[PDB]
């Protein structure tokens, strides 16, 4: 019998049942999308896009519907926090519904194509044998792809006939779905320019239309047909897998580094933003600007939107997770409720001290307080006996500006230490740990989980490329080498050119 | 709803184990 790892090879010379199986796969995938969406809608809390955005709640497909313009529920809420909207039919729920109806329809077509497998369309008119003219099929499908790619950029993304896409400011504060004008100049290759995405789809959409038209009308050269085994459908599976793992590496990368198509209000911040204190710089920039203009400390920090402060917190760093720490970010540090305020440490001489921030590599990190120049002035000691820099000895106090604790100062050492322990994570938040029974350990965001999956699938699909490519080029010996391969063809000398029997000496 | 946590495994196995019995019996019937 067939081995178990070969059952689906019965489809290689059966175009109809091949179409049937591709239909079932497509049904299952459409069905998944609708099921996943409905589960997320049933679990999603829309009441606070500032401290409990989707990406803290382990939402995975919600950000993808939002990215392309789906932002509201039939229930009246929107992900931007607007209330009493009327999204129309193309709500989250109606998107879910459509995918489930599509899946049903694809299932039925799959049954029809399975049963009525023997269609004359699939026979070659000369020989009467099942045959697919793969070179023309490519031109057809490519021409289709280019039309869709063009239309997606020309109508959906521009807002000409469509919603546009998610855009935001550089600090992820004011995002929304907007039409985007194409960027035709060199900044359209800037991954952080949304106009480039528009221009890409228009330009590449036309190139695929032109290329599709070529591939419909122009037959492949005989040299290339033979080289690439173009009458063999497995050469397509080989090249197609290569293009797909190429694609999967690119989307993993842009998800991790960030681009205009992976915004931080839908997927969360990137680790590089923690690495380079990206949000801390903007916050400090603002506080200084408030102070220059005669605001007090309390007033400069109270003006800091809580949403910006929450980005400046390591628990939202996607590189703080673990492989088997499951679920949403909220399950770990909790559901964020309120910014406590900016903690300012000073020693007994009134000098401002700075908690050294935890870097993403470290599961645990000591508490070291520096002056503006980097000189250690306080820490929490491990060995107590020869400690020089204890909070108790240096008289370290903490004062809060902004947030919940604004204007409060604390001087009892164990309370001061408790806040310094939180300050290594960045800005300090009050968390609800009870509601989800949070265990206190950092989880990764959908940015992390997506990158991991797609990097892993890309790598695996590389082996698939190698496997099916080997099988295409070596089809003639899949089952074993020639039992009449003579030792003159592998022994050295006989043939001037390796394996070419016309070059015998 | 504070339902029984073992309810899931009990339902899951309740379906799976006898369904699999029947499917085994049926497939080896067709292949003879």
């Amino acid at each position: 019998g067939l081995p178990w790892y070969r059952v689906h090879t019965v489809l290689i010379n059966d175009p109809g049942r091949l179409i049937a199986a591709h239909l079932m796969h497509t049904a299952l995938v459409a069905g998944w999308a609708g099921s996943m969406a409905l589960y997320e809608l049933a679990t999603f809390d829309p009441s606070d896009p500032v401290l409990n955005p989707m990406w803290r709640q382990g939402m995975f497909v919600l950000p993808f519907m939002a990215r392309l313009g789906v932002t509201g529920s039939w229930s009246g809420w929107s992900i931007t926090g607007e209330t009493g909207i009327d999204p129309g039919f193309w709500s989250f729920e109606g998107v879910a519904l459509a995918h489930i109806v599509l899946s049903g329809l694809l299932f039925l077509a799959a049954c029809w194509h399975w049963v009525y497998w023997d269609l004359e369309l699939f026979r070659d008119p000369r020989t009467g044998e099942p045959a697919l003219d793969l070179p023309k099929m490519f031109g057809i499908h490519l021409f289709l792809a280019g039309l869709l790619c063009f239309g997606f950029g020309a109508f959906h993304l521009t807002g000409l006939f469509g919603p546009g896409m998610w855009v935001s400011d550089p600090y992820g504060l004011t995002g929304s779905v907007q039409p985007v004008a194409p960027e035709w100049g060199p900044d359209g290759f800037n991954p952080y320019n949304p106009g480039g995405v528009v221009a890409h789809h228009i330009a590449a959409g036309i190139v695929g239309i032109i290329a599709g038209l070529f591939h419909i009308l122009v037959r492949p050269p005989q040299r290339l047909y033979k080289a690439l085994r173009m009458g063999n459908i497995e050469t397509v599976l080989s090249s197609s897998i290569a293009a797909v793992f190429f694609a999967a590496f690119v989307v993993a990368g842009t998800m991790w580094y960030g681009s205009a198509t992976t915004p931080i209000e839908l997927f969360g911040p990137t680790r590089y933003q923690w690495d380079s204190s990206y949000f801390q710089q903007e916050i400090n920039r603002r506080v200084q600007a408030s102070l220059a203009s005669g605001a007090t400390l309390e007033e400069a920090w109270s003006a800091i939107p809580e949403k910006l402060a929450f980005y400046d917190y390591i628990g939202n760093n996607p590189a703080k997770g673990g492989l088997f720490r499951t679920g949403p970010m909220n399950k770990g540090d909790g559901i964020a409720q309120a910014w406590k305020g900016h903690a300012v440490f000073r020693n007994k001489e009134g000098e401002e001290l700075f908690v050294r921030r935890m870097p993403a590599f470290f599961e645990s990190f000591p508490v070291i307080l520096t002056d503006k120049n980097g000189v250690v002035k306080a820490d929490i000691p491990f060995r107590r006996a020869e400690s020089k820099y204890s909070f108790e000895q240096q008289g370290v106090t903490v004062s809060f500006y902004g947030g919940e604790l604004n204007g409060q100062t604390f001087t009892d050492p164990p309370t001061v230490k408790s806040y310094a322990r939180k300050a290594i994570f960045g800005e300090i938040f009050e968390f609800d740990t009870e509601t989800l029974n949070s265990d206190g350990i950092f989880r990764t965001s959908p940015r992390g989980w997506f990158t991991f999956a797609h990097a892993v699938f890309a790598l695996l699909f590389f082996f698939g490329h190698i496997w099916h490519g080997a099988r295409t080029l070596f089809r003639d010996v899949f089952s074993g080498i020639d039992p009449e391969l003579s030792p003159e063809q592998v022994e050295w000398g006989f043939y001037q050119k390796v394996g070419d029997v016309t070059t015998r000496r | 709803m504070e339902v029984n946590q073992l309810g899931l495994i009990a339902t899951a196995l309740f379906v799976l184990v006898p369904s699999v019995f029947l499917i085994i019996l049926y497939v080896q019937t067709e292949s003879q």
């Binding site: 589960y39 049954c111 | 709803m1 339902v3 309810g7 899931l8 339902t11 899951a12 379906v15």
Partner: peptide, 30 residues
């Protein structure tokens, strides 16, 4: 998890109806 479980089992039954009807053992006259 219990809602999902109830809906799952119901969905399996609807699929069985489909196969039971359209992929029955055809009855034949011997």
């Amino acid at each position: 998890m219990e809602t999902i479980t109830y809906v799952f089992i119901f969905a399996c039954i609807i699929a069985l109806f489909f196969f039971a009807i359209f992929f029955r053992e055809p009855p034949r006259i011997t």
